[PDB]
UniProtKB/Swiss-Prot annotation:
Stretches that traverse the bilayer: none
Organism superkingdom: Eukaryota
Function according to Swiss-Prot or TrEMBL: Co-chaperone that binds to numerous kinases and promotes their interaction with the Hsp90 complex, resulting in stabilization and promotion of their activity. Inhibits HSP90AA1 ATPase activity.
Residues where Phosphoserine is found: S93
Post-translational events: Constitutively sumoylated by UBE2I.
UniProt subunit comment: Probably forms a complex composed of chaperones HSP90 and HSP70, co-chaperones STIP1/HOP, CDC37, PPP5C, PTGES3/p23, TSC1 and client protein TSC2. Probably forms a complex composed of chaperones HSP90 and HSP70, co-chaperones CDC37, PPP5C, TSC1 and client protein TSC2, CDK4, AKT, RAF1 and NR3C1; this complex does not contain co-chaperones STIP1/HOP and PTGES3/p23. Forms a complex with Hsp90/HSP90AB1 and CDK6. Interacts with HSP90AA1. Interacts with AR, CDK4, CDK6 and EIF2AK1. Interacts with RB1. Interacts with KSR1. Interacts with FLCN, FNIP1 and FNIP2.
Identification of the protein by name: Hsp90 co-chaperone Cdc37
Location in the cell: Cytoplasm
Gene: CDC37
Family of this protein: Belongs to the CDC37 family.
Location of the region described as Disordered in the Swiss-Prot/TrEMBL record: 63-94
Amino acid sequence: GHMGPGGLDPVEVYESLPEELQKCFDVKDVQMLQDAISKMDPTDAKYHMQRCIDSGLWVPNSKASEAKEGEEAGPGDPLLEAVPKTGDEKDVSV
């Protein structure tokens, strides 16, 4: 009914990742990816994983799809200036 948040693309996340991350995905080596996180911070790791899940770019194990919760904001598309463009008002019988 209200679609707004949780709208990230797979390509955006992939391109928004470090050469190491992009190279890790190429080798479909999930094990190697998990290792990289063990070295990185906890907060940073959660952000990276959240992006992959929200972007459906990677499927890390099961029981973890469509990340819920999280601070929302909105889609971003009011569409309104100061005059009614037009609609299906019809010319009444035509």
